[PDB]
Amino acid sequence: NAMLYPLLTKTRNTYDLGGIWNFKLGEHNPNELLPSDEVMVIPTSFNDLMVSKEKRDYIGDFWYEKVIEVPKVSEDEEMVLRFGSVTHQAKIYVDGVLVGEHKGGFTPFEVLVPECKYNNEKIKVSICANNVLDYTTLPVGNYSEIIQEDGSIKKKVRENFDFFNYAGVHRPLKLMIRPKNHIFDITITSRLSDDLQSADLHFLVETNQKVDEVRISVFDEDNKLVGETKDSRLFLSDVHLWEVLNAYLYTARVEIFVDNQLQDVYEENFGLREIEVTNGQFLLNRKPIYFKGFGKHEDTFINGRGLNEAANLMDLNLLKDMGANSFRTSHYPYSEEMMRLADRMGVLVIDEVPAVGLFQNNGTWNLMQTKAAHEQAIQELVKRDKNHPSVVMWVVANEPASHEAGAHDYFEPLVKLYKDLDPQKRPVTLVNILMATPDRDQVMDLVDVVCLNRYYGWYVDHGDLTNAEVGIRKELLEWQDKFPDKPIIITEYGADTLPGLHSTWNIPYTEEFQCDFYEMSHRVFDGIPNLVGEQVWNFADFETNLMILRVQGNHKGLFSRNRQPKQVVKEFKKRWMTIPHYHNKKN
Amino acid sequence: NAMLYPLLTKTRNTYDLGGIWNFKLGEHNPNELLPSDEVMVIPTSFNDLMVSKEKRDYIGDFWYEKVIEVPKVSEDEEMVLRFGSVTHQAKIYVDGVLVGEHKGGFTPFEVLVPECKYNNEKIKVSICANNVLDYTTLPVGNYSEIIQEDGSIKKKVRENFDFFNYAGVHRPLKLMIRPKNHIFDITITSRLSDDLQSADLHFLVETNQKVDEVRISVFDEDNKLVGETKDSRLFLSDVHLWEVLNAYLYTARVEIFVDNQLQDVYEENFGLREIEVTNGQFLLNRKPIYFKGFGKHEDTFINGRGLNEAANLMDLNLLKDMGANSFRTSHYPYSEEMMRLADRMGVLVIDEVPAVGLFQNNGTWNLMQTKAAHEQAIQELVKRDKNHPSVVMWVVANEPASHEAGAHDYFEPLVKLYKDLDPQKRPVTLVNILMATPDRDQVMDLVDVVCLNRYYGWYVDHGDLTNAEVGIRKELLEWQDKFPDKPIIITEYGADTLPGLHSTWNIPYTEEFQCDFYEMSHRVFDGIPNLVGEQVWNFADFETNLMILRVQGNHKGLFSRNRQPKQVVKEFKKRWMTIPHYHNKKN
Numbered sequence A, B: 001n002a003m004l005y006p007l008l009t010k011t012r013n014t015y016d017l018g019g020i021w022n023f024k025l026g027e028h029n030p031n032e033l034l035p036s037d038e039v040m041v042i043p044t045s046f047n048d049l050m051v052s053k054e055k056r057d058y059i060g061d062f063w064y065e066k067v068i069e070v071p072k073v074s075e076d077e078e079m080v081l082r083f084g085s086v087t088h089q090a091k092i093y094v095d096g097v098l099v100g101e102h103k104g105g106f107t108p109f110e111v112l113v114p115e116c117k118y119n120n121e122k123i124k125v126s127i128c129a130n131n132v133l134d135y136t137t138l139p140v141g142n143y144s145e146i147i148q149e150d151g152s153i154k155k156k157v158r159e160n161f162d163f164f165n166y167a168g169v170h171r172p173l174k175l176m177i178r179p180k181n182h183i184f185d186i187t188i189t190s191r192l193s194d195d196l197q198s199a200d201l202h203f204l205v206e207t208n209q210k211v212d213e214v215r216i217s218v219f220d221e222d223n224k225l226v227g228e229t230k231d232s233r234l235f236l237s238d239v240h241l242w243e244v245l246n247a248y249l250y251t252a253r254v255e256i257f258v259d260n261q262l263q264d265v266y267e268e269n270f271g272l273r274e275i276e277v278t279n280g281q282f283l284l285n286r287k288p289i290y291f292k293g294f295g296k297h298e299d300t301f302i303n304g305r306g307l308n309e310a311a312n313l314m315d316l317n318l319l320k321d322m323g324a325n326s327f328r329t330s331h332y333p334y335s336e337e338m339m340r341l342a343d344r345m346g347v348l349v350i351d352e353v354p355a356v357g358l359f360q361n362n363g364t365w366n367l368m369q370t371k372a373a374h375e376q377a378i379q380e381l382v383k384r385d386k387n388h389p390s391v392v393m394w395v396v397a398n399e400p401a402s403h404e405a406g407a408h409d410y411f412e413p414l415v416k417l418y419k420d421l422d423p424q425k426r427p428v429t430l431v432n433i434l435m436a437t438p439d440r441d442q443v444m445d446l447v448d449v450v451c452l453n454r455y456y457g458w459y460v461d462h463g464d465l466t467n468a469e470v471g472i473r474k475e476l477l478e479w480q481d482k483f484p485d486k487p488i489i490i491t492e493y494g495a496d497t498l499p500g501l502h503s504t505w506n507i508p509y510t511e512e513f514q515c516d517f518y519e520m521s522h523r524v525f526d527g528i529p530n531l532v533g534e535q536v537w538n539f540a541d542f543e544t545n546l547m548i549l550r551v552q553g554n555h556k557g558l559f560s561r562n563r564q565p566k567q568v569v570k571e572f573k574k575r576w577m578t579i580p581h582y583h584n585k586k587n
């Protein structure tokens, strides 16, 4: 119900509630006043702000509480609390009274403030956040409890994924004043003409009550009116297409009227671009695209998984400079701010739900109770991002046990849910793990694009690039042979590389070996006609939990965690600026 | 044989053949002249001198060759080539003729030059070294051959041990002119008086032919005569004991006479000190000793496993400064130069054969064909090092599969061999692996001292010092209970630590965690009465092969490979200078 990005309009007052909140790790009664003994920032992960390991490793309920002054609310208006996200679970309280809940730490949700408080001077907002992950949540965790022999139970979450379980309120919290009779949702679809000069637009505006008129004004990038409609349909000539690294955005100003007066107004951006997957190719605007980019992470020093718009722009500027053109929201939906940035900069985005960890240590599909959370995640993501021209593909899961029995039955309705909910019917994919090699895999028949995470030379044939090349070329041909019409994209491939580590003997973990690894990989990729994309793992080093294979987090980044480059960055820029975005390898 | 250290005496002309030799990786006919296209230094490992990975990873025969001018050799003299070691196997050639052979890369051997060449102007010495390791060699390797489909055989050695397979001529090669009738061995033993003020010296001088008189002169550290005998036995008064970090060495000048004229002369050093293991204690000069020190490696940059006397003295000076008192020759006998240095500096040495890798990647003892090499290793080591007062204990194996069936039958005669060969009958031990818990192990009953390699907090309970502390304390108490009168020494304990890695959250691989790991370890150790020693792994970072657990070699060193300290070095110096060398924890 809150998939529309929060705006300041003539009918919508949007206030930011970010800043210092009273904080507590542990139990709390929302009817009681949380003291200011401990405080916390919104938005940010709380973890790296804790000095001790004990508090940084906390699992369970943790509270945010602050008294907010009530703004003027008219009779025909309603006041809601719009969360960008709360990680992972949340129960929201107003004056000690439960007013909303949400499960899933990477999707936005709104909560209605009771009308009986609109004339009060202040309201106390309490946020009960929860970072527990188990077999019912996305992402998947291994939950356990141990008795401290002190009388209390201590919770632990052994992650089923390769990234640190950062938690907290990671995205902006807004106090929204909006009309009771308001615009609920906007869907924008287009059919491009045969000459790509015209477009048949369709605006599906959802309301909660009914209005006499639904007016839509369309403006270009010069803020010039180019179209008007009251019947949810509009034809437009002299269109400017949204292009890769050359974006063009229109704005649809939607106005609803009752008795000839404005009830609510909203502005939704959109881009004109065509997507089609056919004949082992990914077509953008009817031209073959070669994906060049990164698997990423919402990860930065200090803030952790918290929003940092400066980081987004810095990352995307580096992406553009290297000659790259895309990235994947691994392994969870990123902030709306990032998606809007990608729209504005013309960066292709592979959108992904938090479906990572669907893998036992078998009998995975008798153990995974994630169906409910998986369906909601797909519902929320599509509803939130369906209008983004940057979003070009959906991901049902990252490295699930797609070789075990019951896998095909699990994913078929989920792939279908993507196809049913997305009005653009964009391609959906499943990110494949090495254990699910062509013969054993039983799910890749459901998707439109084959996405592979392969580490020949790092995990398999470690430090053995000679035999790694034989292995990767062998399997890529197997995939291409099993699905002759499906395009292939490498979504993950890389090697842990610590800055400063050097050698003349192609030694793993050194900067030179990272260069050698990618050079070999690309030699193989360029020989596969159906391979239409390469996305490295990762853009930058990121935090993980404690595992012997992890040398203080993950170091497969091309850049360090401070966005400083490694040796391999210079090499990628040469390759990526040589290969055009529109690149046909069928010739 | 070649047990005696090469000396320059009036009867023995010893020349060093170190320098630049003509070199070749591959096949060679010793009847032919090796060109100077490739050269190599003696002594050093050849590996890190190769720029390419291909030549560095070479396995098989590799040749050293040089034309050497023959010096004056009289009628009663012979000329031999004395190799400190050749790693791992060697065939020696003089003018293309096979003249000597040795197996085992860490023990000395001599080879006779044919008498028919003593009046030649020059001789051509060819060394056919070989670095192949398998199930018949010490250390144990996993050998395999793969055809490159070019018609050639590519050999590969997969090491069964955690250190790089450095190879070459690592130790000085001497050209020795000695009398045909010479002293080939000298054994020095002593019985200390009850007041430790006197000593009964016994000498066993071995010659290859008959001699009329064996005269032995003993000189103190002031080079003053304190005794002389023709009966190979001598009583000494006002003796000065060899002490920990306070060494006193006597010199035995041994002269053999034939027909009233000097036949040969040699000088052998020795120290007066007593060793006894009893009641869960290690007694040196009848006082309880607490071992503080390191497991080491013959490893430096550039030289690899090659001898560096400067490195030996630098390391031993650091050892002394930190308050340490001992080290272990893991996992192979070190250079004679190191042993003699330890004698001079009063450093305790745990002497060790290359019996590492006796563990199948169960049924280890149905696959290990190492019996012959193991017997030779023990024979060579004892014969070479028995006169060193620094040597206080022998190691029969490092981390073998001592929990599997057949282990006891394998080690029982090998432990016996140490006792039979060593005239001092020093304690022998077995370095135990973590898989062989007190219940599973079936070999520790044979040894005098229990040596344990434990990594609670690193390998088991990784980054969980809380649960690690419980685990290590639990097992240590089990060992103490199973063997109530056997002393316990921790011979390996540490955590990989890369210089520059930092955190406030006790993160593995950081310098802080290394401190935390050792702090926890010591808290446990101090509560175990039978634990009489702690030797960390490792003294310094060292090179290993390629595998995902190795971040460019092993980083468990207290010092970096360049001998620069890590954060923990300061903490160890505090502890080791508080705990005396003579420290009784029975009280």
Ligand SMILES: [Mg+2]
Binding pocket: A307, A308, A309
């Ligand atoms: Mg910020």
Ligand SMILES: [Mg+2]
Binding pocket: A454, A455, A456, A457, A472, A493, A521
């Ligand atoms: Mg690969």
Ligand SMILES: [Mg+2]
Binding pocket: B454, B455, B456, B457, B472, B493, B521
């Ligand atoms: Mg331990």
Ligand SMILES: [Mg+2]
Binding pocket: B525, B526, B579, B585
């Ligand atoms: Mg103590």
